[PDB]
């Protein structure tokens, strides 16, 4: 039944909106993990920078040079990690936009489903009333309602047969003779009560 | 426009139903009247009116 599919297919989309949902979260975790790792590397570099801020004074230049040389190794990690974190930011914001748009498109699609299913029932619910209505007395001859008149006439047609109606002569006469009985009977009336 | 349009069909269809319902009895009644007439005048002739060989 295709009308059931629209309920089933939208069910399948729902799995994605919870599968893609999980994928996005996993992306954020590593982004946070990468973010944390960068801070530690600079902290060690900062410690050498703070610690290097104690030798150059008072005339100990040699020691300060060595400390900064070590920090360059940690700085290189920070630079590589620093650029990556900024790059990864565009991905997390980009992917969320797809979720924002896709989620919007889903409920919008959901709304129209009922509006068309309702109009499907309305037309279907209309088919079987007007179809039979014509079958009864409106579509054409042979309609069940009209056929009743056929049986009525068939029996009524026998009525004039078994008991033939009076001839037009008698109809012309029986009424003819009533005009005299009424007047003749009234003739003795108008003359008696005069 | 759709909700008002569809209601009109219900308004018309509901009207047509009871109208159809009314005529049913009027024709069933006339069916019994003719049927209820067949078996009285049929035997009446069988008794003394139809023709010779009548039971009467």
Largest interface: A-B, 19 and 20 residues
Q: What is the oligomeric state here?
A: part of a larger assembly
* Strand percent estimate of chain A: under 5%
Radius of gyration of chain A: 53 Å
Shape of chain A: rod-shaped
Query: Helix count of chain A?
Result: 4
N to C succession of SSEs of chain A: HHHH
How would you sum up the major sheet of chain A? none
The structural class of chain A is mainly alpha
Q: What is the number of beta strands of chain A? A: 0
End-to-end separation of chain A: 96 Å
Helix content of chain A: over 70%
Characteristics of this structure?
part of a larger assembly; 2 chains; 194 residues; mainly alpha; rod-shaped; lipid binding protein
How would you characterize the overall build of this protein?
This is part of a larger assembly, with 2 copies of chain A. With 194 residues, chain A is mainly α. Chain A is 89% helix and 0% strand. Chain A is built from 4 helices and no strands. The longest helix of chain A is centred in the middle third of the chain and has 78 residues, at 61-138. Chains A and B meet through helix 2 and helix 3 of A and helix 1 of B.
Summarize the structure.
Chain A: ADP 4 binds at residues 137-138, 140, 142. Chain A has 194 residues and is an all-alpha fold.
